[PDB]
């Protein structure tokens, strides 16, 4: 935002921050959707306490998806969670907020520790049984499995496709002040 | 947001309404007169009748939006041309279909 | 070991001793009232004194 | 004594504070909420008088409806306390000791802790 | 108006009115589905059973279809950006995009919820009706043009949330045979109801006080005019009483934090999440994060940007206090629902810090 | 134990003394000597057609 | 949400000022710098801080002993005569 | 395009070539590049890019 | 790209540790290793974000075509050193490495010690050369010397072969 | 995505003048008439008032 | 709301813009015709003089006492669990007194107020006399705050929690450098503001600006890298 | 791009084609076509209904059968009378949605938001400086939805 | 190192010239109240005719000079050779 | 006081005093409406008190502990610094003889006004401008009634 | 491929290396530079015309833009 001979040149986009907040909220909501998706595919009465995380030790797809979602919640790379924290840090640096950067880093470290503390209770001595039984046999929702697969695909490798979402969010935020 | 001209123009008094048809007709007549004048600057006094009609029919905010759009359009028209824009867009798309290697071993700056 | 991780572990274990696990209604009401009153006092302190 | 605006604001703030000052009874909380809503309506009327604004005065009917909804919800909640086996005085539902209660005392419902 | 009423004044509200009418008619028809008189001249092929457990899948599908119809209507929408219904509604491209995004998210969540409901019917028709009604009015918040309409819509949303919380099943089918002659006193639902009601009362009182104080300051509660007047005060210095502005800003921020359950006021939300169904928790998170949090962010960024010079200190102090007080609490949870609530609180605090950075 | 815990401070002081001595005789100092202007060692520097 | 109406069902006293201020705000591309006069008039109409300050100044001046007796007024002539002018209906005669 | 970081030094900076005065705390990205980031960090800064690369290779060889 | 690739290796290492280690105590060891690696990654990411925001370009040649201020260079160097030393490992951020080498599977520990430390060193060297710094390297030199001294001194008390190899 | 890119380019072109006007409106109290801002203030208030 | 705006003032830009400066003298100079009461009351400018070390120390001590009283009122006394017998005796005294509430409040809050006043005075003296000659503002503030807070933590809370006190002091010093020392979000001047001098002509200014903008063309990476197509 | 002829049985397809993804236009922007009556009343909007609205209502009624069947597929343990009543109510809601869409289309046509057989005297000249979709839509069905690309 | 690199700038001190005039011109705006007081004192002195010899604007002139030189003197003092602060403190 | 019946009596007295204050400000219509609403609410509350607190024995709570511990200093601090009055002045600030705005009358406006009821502002607000707010209030009331029925069930 | 055919830079870079930068300059820099040099181009043309008449605008002498 400099002025040269009464003609100004702007190299900054004022709508980037709103798009950044929207993308962070969207990523958090998407992670929460997959986090609760596994709960929806199991007997929701079998997961009560924090130590009741070994109930996730089941058929390999459930365990792998749960581990990936737990990692994504803490924002570790290269899941969708790391994208939000990295973009927030980049925006804060672009706004020259060193104290805010330090506080965000401390908070992210504390959150990573809290989220990873649950991974300790993941191990179980044997395969668990948290699936509801229909017609005398355990019922697995194929539609829920497909939704969880799509979410896991968009989280594990969705970092490469971040360009289109970022462009869409920037376009949305462009008319916020216009 | 406080200095947003569009946001300020969007507001109106309680019960205030805008006659879009009349405003657009008067604006079209005034802008046709101005284009017939064909000047870089918007000398509204060159068509006193058309300027008066634009002032009476179009509100302050509508007139401001129209003037800003006209100024931007005039700048763009004096800037580029249709064939040049089309060729540049085609070349840019073709380049985006490739990769931009780093400018190693430069000779400036 | 003691300097790098035990410090944080002890800080957490000690600060947790001053926090109630199950929220009480009186605790919540007092917390809201104290938040409002002390935030107003602190904000006014910077405006006039700090 | 004090100017009307200052008196009304101070009364609203004091009522908000006193809502927590008294003991923890649901009925008392509902009564205090009703009093606070009435004070808010009075403040809105005084402000509409000060500024002569129609929208400011229009709040009283909306404020009255909101207060009625809140009072009905509170009455329904208090009625439900009977089936939940929870005393109206919320301090009796927590085992944490407090110096405000003169007679609080809870013991395990057993006869002899050590049998022989 | 008094003389003529333009169509655009309620053209947007017309689809909302149609959806509300359809939903109300359907819900009323579901209330008498078991009252079917049989005449003495009619034949019953099979014996009628009055014990009916209708899956709320039908209500979920109907609500999803209505939301899709609303999305289609918004897709074909066209016009000019202005104020609607006596400047009480804001119809901007950004507001329309926000409404569309909220509707899409609600539709995806409703599809997931219906798929989960087809597995085990642990939810009743009332919960689905409450969700549909909440979804009916949730998108309207983005179109608010004044703090009075925003307060009314937020009060309506809070009432819908309380109603949905009341729709939670108290008893469940369990194989616990040892408890057949003993009474188990569970106070989770009562605690959730009490906490929600008290927090809603306090937040509504704060928001009403803030609106009443703001109206006296400038004479209007609209979005753009308030910002213009506030920025003018910084240039004309007519009102130098920074104490009143600080008090109004503090009241607004405290009310928003209380409604959103922002730290250090977090034990309320912790207790709220500890006594609700999983689908109810999912719905509450989707509502709070997508609507309440984004609305608070826009209020601190787009609505009250002219007062951002004052909100900065309060926001920074609140963030520091939350970071200092929640870190110790975040390492002592022993419930999955408490862990989810703590994750939501941490994300909210991080987003608050990000918004504080953005306001610079 | 005191010497071990204070060893980093003693090491820092010794390093500072050695750096001062090197500055006295103009020797190699504990400084980021960016003499390559950022060009990496044996980094292929070719242009693309 | 500007009502602009009076408590008697009429028009709020600041309605024309608000109209002029809105016109100025929608007119200037930089009304923040340009709408100073209209903004000041609207602010004075809404919050009469200027009137309160003038009243405070008048009270401070009355705390002084400069003025003893103001000239009385006779409405039959619609004219002000000095306090020493011994006219009819005066408190002292 | 090269950006910049806002400086915190509440120090006045005097420029006589344009006969101007600017604050270290209040300076644009271009001003920081031209006055604060204009420091030299190369042995032969007057050489071109390829010239300096060749000079570095020759200095290592020497 | 360099930072993204450097950050991706943590997930495979955590997956290997959580699922292949035979020791029961390896759960807390894997958690601590993940935590330390994430802390180092966060420091490196903060430094990289600062560098990228300072100059909106993604080329080392463009980085050389720009000069960082004194405070900027000091902060960048300190953050890069902190991240790389947490990933080196360096004293006293070597508890994670010690516990990992104590508890991790033999193949993973061979790969973790052999490769990850070298990758972190290579990243630190690449970033450091691309940034000109006028500060004194006394802090980093002293840190390295003290870490070497501490690691060497503890060898006489190590009866576990894996622990002694880790200290070396 | 392509349509949104085109629309965002147009929106940014529109918002270009918004930033300039806000910075002119963000001039400090008394800085509007300053020599470094006098030219911009005169152009925006006198020349750019043609509605 | 600005923090330490008196210190954070651009004197040159303030003088150029003509805004009234807090650095100007705010004092009274009565003439040789006033009454004795007027002359005596004119001494109040001493309380408005910031150069008086006694005045600065007294103001800082008052601020510290107020902070301690606020801490005790908000979190201090409510956290404490006094013995029941003491409370009973206090209530008996309150019944038998005319203004017993004031006496009880004084007996309660006196230690916190005294400790706060003393700590504030000590911190003000240390800051104004020990850390005013350093070069690096961030480093000096960090060192001073860390030392003071670690010393306080070892003395006020407990000797054991010294590391936590030192970390808190470091954080407080960092926050003070960020906001109380730097005009972050408290700027009194527009970004990029420059004041011209030298009586340079308009043509010379235009030529210099064109030359500078030619360098501004070098700011674009693609312009520097020459990766632009012809349009 | 050409537009479906107004007042036909396929006028609703014009509401499915837009020049830009902008939900609303600016306060001072000229409409794509001439404006018939900006100050439109409810009675005027009702009088503005035509064969386009009739065809939209017919399409809503036709499509409403599959949506009603899908909704009814989720009902269990309900009487045939109840199922028939619910299906009839759903079909009525679909028809009402179609009527609302037709009324909105008529209002847009009277306001000139969509094509209504009218063309402005002087076309607004817009130069597509950023054009990354012309080629993309030129070789697919995406052109049929983009009015004038 | 930084010290072995060529110098990219040369100020007035590095040019061996006295920048005292430029320093005074730059620091005059900082001291305006003192200048106004000195002008008022000079006007009062010129208003009076053959006043008492114990009536001079010398005190105001000293105040103005102290205000002006309080900033100009130290700043140039920072740019002099041999004025480096030292190694540690 | 902790007795619920005495608390209710004090609330009724406070409501009466608020109505008197409103009448003093010449707002008798809203005063009467509030008085009626509060009387109905008080009747409902008395019924509830007879239902749930027939005995009336309040909990044995002592105000001294909480009052002396935090409440008194907190109230002192809050009242000490909170002042949101910018330009409000007392009626005795200036002599009433210097005020003449209440004497001017708009005879033509009165001749052009046909209003005979004080409910004109209420109608113009809750029917013309805030019609959206009125509709929202109605929908909220319907939803609250449904929620109360569900809670009773 | 298709997901990366809109910009000459990788998607990861464009998402990460464009932090609040003007998207017009990021995607189509040439038009952005031409628009930023709108009045500059007119001034250069005026100076060239004046020099064609023998009037060298030394103030506009630096205004010789290639792109």
TrEMBL record, chain B:
Disulfide bonds join 23-58, 33-47. This is Uncharacterized protein. It comes from Tetrahymena thermophila (strain SB210). The chain holds residues 36 to 144 of 144 of the full protein.
TrEMBL record, chain E:
The chain crosses the membrane at residues 6-28, 58-76, 96-113, 125-142, 148-167, 188-216, 236-258, 278-304, 310-331, 338-359. It comes from the Eukaryota. InterPro entries: ND/Mrp_TM (IPR001750). Keywords: Membrane, Mitochondrion, Transmembrane, Transmembrane helix. This is Ymf65. Residues 195-357 form the NADH:quinone oxidoreductase/Mrp antiporter transmembrane domain. It comes from Tetrahymena thermophila. Pfam families: Proton_antipo_M.
UniProtKB/TrEMBL annotation, chain G:
It comes from the Eukaryota. Disulfide bonds join 14-45, 24-35. This is GRAM domain protein. It comes from Tetrahymena thermophila (strain SB210).
From TrEMBL, chain I:
It is found in: Cell membrane; Mitochondrion membrane. Signal peptide: none annotated. The chain crosses the membrane at residues 1-20, 32-55, 75-96, 131-152. It comes from the Eukaryota. Core subunit of the mitochondrial membrane respiratory chain NADH dehydrogenase (Complex I) which catalyzes electron transfer from NADH through the respiratory chain, using ubiquinone as an electron acceptor. Essential for the catalytic activity and assembly of complex I. Belongs to the complex I subunit 4 family. This is NADH-ubiquinone oxidoreductase chain 4. The gene is nad4. The chain holds residues 170 to 337 of 505 of the full protein.
């Amino acid at each position: 935002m400099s002025i040269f001979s009464n003609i100004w040149i702007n190299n900054d986009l004022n709508s980037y921050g709103l798009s950044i907040l929207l993308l962070n909220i969207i990523n958090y909501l998407i992670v929460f959707m997959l986090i609760l998706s596994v709960i929806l595919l199991t007997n929701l009465s079998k997961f009560k306490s924090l130590n009741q995380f070994k109930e996730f030790n089941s058929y390999n797809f459930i365990l792998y998806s749960l581990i990936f979602s737990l990692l994504s919640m803490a924002g570790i790379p290269p899941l969708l969670g790391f994208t939000g924290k990295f973009l927030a840090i980049l925006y804060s640096s672009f706004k020259s907020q060193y104290l805010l950067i330090l506080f965000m880093t401390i908070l992210n470290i504390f959150g990573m520790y809290f989220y990873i503390q649950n991974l300790r209770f993941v191990v179980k001595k044997n395969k668990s049984s948290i699936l509801n039984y229909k017609n005398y046999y355990v019922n697995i929702n194929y539609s829920i499995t497909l939704n969880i697969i799509l979410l896991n695909f968009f989280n594990f490798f969705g970092i490469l496709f971040l360009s289109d979402l970022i462009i869409i969010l920037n376009y949305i935020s462009s008319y916020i002040y216009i | 947001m406080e200095f947003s001209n569009a946001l300020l123009s969007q507001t109106k008094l309680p019960g205030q309404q805008y006659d879009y048809k009349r405003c657009f007709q008067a604006s079209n007549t005034h802008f046709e007169c101005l284009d017939s004048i064909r000047d870089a600057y918007d000398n509204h006094h060159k068509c006193p009748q058309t300027y008066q009609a634009w002032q009476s029919s179009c509100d302050v905010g509508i007139r401001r939006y129209q003037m800003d759009n006209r100024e931007q359009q005039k700048k763009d028209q004096l800037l580029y041309s249709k064939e040049q824009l089309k060729n540049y867009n085609a070349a840019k798309n073709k380049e985006a279909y490739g990769i931009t290697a780093p400018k190693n071993l430069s000779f400036a700056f | 070991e003691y300097l790098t991780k035990k410090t944080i572990d002890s800080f957490i274990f000690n600060n947790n001793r001053f926090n109630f696990i199950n929220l009480v209604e009186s605790k919540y009401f007092l917390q809201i009232l104290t938040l409002i009153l002390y935030l107003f006092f602190i904000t006014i302190f910077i405006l006039f004194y700090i | 004594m004090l100017t009307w605006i200052s008196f009304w604001s101070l009364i609203f703030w004091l009522i908000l504070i006193i809502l927590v000052l008294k003991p923890k009874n649901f009925i008392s909380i509902l009564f205090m909420s009703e009093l606070t809503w009435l004070a808010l309506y009075c403040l809105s009327l005084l402000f509409g008088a000060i500024y002569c604004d129609i929208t400011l005065l229009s709040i009283s009917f909306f404020i009255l409806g909101v207060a009625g909804l809140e009072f009905s919800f509170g009455i329904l909640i208090a009625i439900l306390y009977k089936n939940l086996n929870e005393s109206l005085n919320t301090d009796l539902n927590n085992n944490n000791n407090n110096q405000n209660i003169f007679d609080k005392n809870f013991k395990t419902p057993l006869e002899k802790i050590n049998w022989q | 108006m008094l003389l003529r009423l333009l169509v655009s004044e309620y053209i947007f509200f017309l689809p909302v009115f149609t959806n509300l009418f359809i939903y109300w008619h359907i819900f009323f028809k579901n209330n008498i589905n078991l009252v079917n008189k049989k005449n003495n001249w009619d034949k019953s092929i099979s014996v009628k059973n009055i014990i009916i457990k209708q899956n709320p899948s039908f209500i979920i599908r109907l609500n999803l279809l209505l939301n899709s119809l609303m999305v289609l209507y918004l897709i074909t929408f066209n016009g000019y950006s202005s104020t609607f219904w006596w400047s009480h509604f804001k119809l901007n491209n950004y507001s329309l995009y926000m409404y569309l995004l909220v509707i899409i998210f609600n539709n995806y969540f409703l599809y997931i919820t219906e798929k989960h409901i087809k597995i085990l019917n642990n939810y009743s028709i009332d919960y689905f009706f409450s969700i549909i009604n909440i979804t009916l009015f949730i998108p309207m918040i983005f179109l608010s043009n004044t703090l009075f309409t925003f307060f009314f819509l937020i009060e309506l949303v809070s009432c819908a949330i309380f109603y949905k919380f009341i729709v939670s099943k108290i008893s469940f089918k369990n194989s616990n045979y040892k408890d057949n002659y003993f009474s188990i006193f569970s106070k989770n639902y009562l605690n959730v109801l009490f906490y929600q009601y008290w927090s809603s009362f306090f937040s509504s009182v704060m928001i009403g006080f803030c609106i009443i104080y703001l109206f006296s300051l400038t004479g209007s509660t609209e979005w753009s005019i308030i910002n213009f007047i506030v920025a003018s005060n910084n240039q004309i210095n007519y009102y130098t009483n920074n104490i009143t502005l600080l008090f109004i800003c503090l009241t607004l921020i405290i009310g928003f934090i209380i409604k959103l359950g922002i730290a250090p006021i977090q034990l309320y939300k912790i207790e709220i999440y500890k006594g609700l169904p999983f689908l109810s928790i999912f719905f509450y998170t989707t509502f709070y994060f997508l609507i309440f949090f984004l609305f608070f962010s826009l209020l601190f960024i787009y609505y009250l940007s002219a007062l951002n010079n004052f909100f900065w200190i309060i926001l920074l102090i609140i963030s520091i206090i939350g970071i200092f007080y929640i870190i110790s609490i975040i390492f002592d949870i022993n419930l999955f629902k408490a862990f989810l609530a703590y994750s939501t609180i941490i994300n909210s605090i991080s987003f608050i810090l990000l918004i504080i950075a953005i306001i610079f | 134990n005191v010497l071990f815990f204070c060893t980093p401070l003693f090491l820092y002081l010794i390093l500072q003394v050695e750096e001062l001595n090197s500055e006295k005789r103009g020797g190699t100092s504990n400084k980021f000597y960016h003499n390559n202007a950022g060009f990496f060692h044996f980094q292929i520097y070719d242009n693309k057609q | 949400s500007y009502s602009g109406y009076s408590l008697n069902g009429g028009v709020h006293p600041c309605l024309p000022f608000y109209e002029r201020m809105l016109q100025c705000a929608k007119s200037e591309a930089l009304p923040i710098k340009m709408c100073t006069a209209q903004t000041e008039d609207y602010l004075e109409c809404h919050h009469r801080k200027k009137q309160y300050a003038l009243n405070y100044a008048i009270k401070k001046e009355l705390n002084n002993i400069r003025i003893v007796a103001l000239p009385r007024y006779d409405e039959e002539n619609d004219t002000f005569v000095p306090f020493s002018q011994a006219t009819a209906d005066h408190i002292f005669q | 395009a090269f950006g910049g970081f806002r400086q915190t030094d509440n120090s006045l900076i005097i420029d006589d070539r344009r006969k101007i005065i600017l604050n270290t705390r209040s300076l644009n990205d271009f001003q920081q590049k031209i006055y604060l980031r204009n420091f030299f960090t190369n042995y032969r800064p007057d050489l071109s890019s390829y010239d300096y690369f060749a000079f570095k290779e020759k200095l290592r060889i020497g | 790209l360099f930072f993204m690739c450097y950050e991706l290796l943590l997930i495979p290492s955590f997956l290997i540790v959580y699922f292949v280690s035979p020791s029961r105590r390896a759960i807390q060891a894997s958690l601590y290793f993940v935590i330390w690696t994430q802390l180092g990654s966060l420091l490196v990411l903060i430094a990289i974000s600062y560098i990228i925001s300072i100059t909106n370009t993604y080329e080392f040649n463009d980085l050389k075509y720009f000069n960082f201020t004194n405070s900027e260079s000091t902060i960048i160097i300190f953050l890069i050193f902190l991240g790389f030393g947490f990933k080196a490992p360096i004293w006293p951020f070597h508890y994670w490495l010690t516990k990992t080498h104590v508890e991790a599977p033999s193949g993973f520990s061979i790969y973790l010690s052999g490769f990850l430390v070298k990758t972190a060193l290579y990243g630190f060297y690449k970033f450091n050369t691309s940034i000109f710094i006028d500060i004194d390297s006394s802090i980093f030199i002293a840190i390295c010397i003290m870490g070497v001294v501490d690691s060497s001194l503890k060898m006489w008390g190590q009866t576990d072969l894996k622990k002694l190899v880790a200290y070396g | 995505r392509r349509m949104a890119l085109e629309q965002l380019c147009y929106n940014e072109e529109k918002l270009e003048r918004y930033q300039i006007r806000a910075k002119l409106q963000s001039l400090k109290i008394g800085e509007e008439l300053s020599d470094a801002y006098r030219e911009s203030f005169f152009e925006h208030a006198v020349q750019k008032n043609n509605i | 709301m600005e923090l330490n705006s008196s210190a954070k003032e651009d004197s040159h830009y303030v003088g150029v813009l003509g805004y009234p400066s807090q650095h100007d003298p705010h004092t009274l100079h009565p003439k040789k015709h006033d009454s004795t009461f007027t002359k005596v009351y004119a001494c109040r400018d001493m309380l408005w003089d910031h150069h008086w070390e006694v005045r600065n120390t007294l103001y800082a001590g008052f601020k510290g006492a107020l902070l301690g009283v606020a801490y005790a009122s908000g979190f201090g006394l409510i956290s404490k669990t006094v013995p029941s017998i003491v409370l009973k005796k206090m209530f008996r005294f309150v019944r038998n007194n005319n203004f017993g509430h004031i006496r009880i409040m004084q007996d309660l809050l006196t230690p916190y107020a005294l400790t706060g006043f003393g700590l504030g005075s000590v911190y003000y003296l240390y800051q104004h006399n020990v850390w005013e000659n350093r070069s690096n503002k961030w480093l000096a503030e960090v060192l001073s705050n860390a030392l003071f807070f670690q010393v306080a933590t070892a003395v006020c809370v407990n000797p054991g929690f010294h590391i936590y006190g030192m970390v808190g002091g470091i954080l407080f010093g960092t926050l003070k450098y960020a906001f109380y020392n730097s005009s972050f979000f408290q700027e009194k001047e527009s970004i990029g503001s420059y004041t011209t001098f030298g009586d340079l002509s308009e043509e010379e200014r235009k030529k210099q600006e064109y030359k500078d903008y030619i360098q501004f063309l070098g700011n674009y990476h693609k312009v520097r890298n020459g990766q632009l197509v012809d349009l | 791009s050409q537009t479906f002829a107004h007042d036909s049985f396929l006028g609703g397809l014009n509401l499915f084609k837009r020049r830009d993804p902008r939900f609303v236009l600016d306060q001072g922007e000229r409409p794509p076509y001439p404006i018939i009556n900006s100050n439109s009343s409810f009675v005027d909007v009702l009088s503005n209904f035509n064969k386009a609205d009739f065809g939209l209502v017919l399409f809503s009624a036709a499509i409403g059968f599959p949506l009603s069947r899908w909704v009814l597929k989720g009902l269990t343990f309900s009487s045939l009378n109840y199922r028939r009543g619910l299906f009839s109510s759903v079909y009525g809601g679909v028809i009402l949605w179609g009527l609302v869409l037709g009324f909105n289309n008529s209002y847009y046509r009277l306001n000139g938001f969509v094509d209504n057989g009218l063309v402005w005297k002087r076309k607004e000249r817009k130069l597509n400086k950023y054009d990354f979709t012309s080629e993309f839509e030129d070789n697919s069905f995406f052109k049929k939805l983009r009015i004038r690309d | 190192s930084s010290g072995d690199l060529p110098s990219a700038t040369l100020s007035m001190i590095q040019q061996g010239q006295d920048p005292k005039e430029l320093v005074l011109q730059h620091c005059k705006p900082n001291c305006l109240h003192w200048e106004q007081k000195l002008k008022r004192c000079e006007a009062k002195l010129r208003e009076l005719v053959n006043a008492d010899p114990e009536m001079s604007c010398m005190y105001p002139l000293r105040d103005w000079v102290t205000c002006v030189e309080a900033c100009v003197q130290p700043q140039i003092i920072s740019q002099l050779v041999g004025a480096q602060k030292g190694r540690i403190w | 006081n902790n007795n619920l019946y005495y608390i209710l009596l004090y609330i009724f007295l406070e409501i009466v005093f608020f109505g008197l204050f409103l009448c003093l400000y010449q707002l008798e219509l809203f005063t009467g409406f509030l008085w009626v609403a509060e009387f109905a609410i008080v009747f409902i509350a008395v019924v509830l008190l007879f239902y749930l607190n027939i005995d009336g024995l309040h909990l044995k709570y002592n105000h001294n502990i909480n009052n002396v511990l935090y409440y008194t200093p907190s109230l002192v601090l809050f009242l000490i610094f909170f002042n949101i009055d910018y330009f409000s002045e007392l009626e005795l600030f200036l002599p009433l003889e210097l005020s003449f705005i209440d004497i001017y009358d708009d005879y033509y406006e009165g001749f052009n006004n046909s209003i005979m009821n004080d409910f004109t502002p209420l109608t113009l607000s809750y029917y013309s401008i805030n019609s959206a707010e009125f509709i929202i209030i109605g929908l909220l009331l319907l939803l609250g009634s449904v929620a109360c029925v569900n809670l009773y069930k | 491929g298709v997901w990366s055919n809109i910009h000459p830079t990788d998607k990861v870079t464009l998402s990460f290396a464009n932090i609040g930068r003007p998207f017009r300059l990021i995607y189509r820099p040439e038009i952005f530079l031409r628009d930023q040099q709108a009045k500059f181009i007119q001034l250069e043309k005026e100076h060239i015309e004046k020099s064609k008449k023998g009037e060298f605008v030394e103030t506009t002498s630096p205004l010789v833009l290639w792109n």
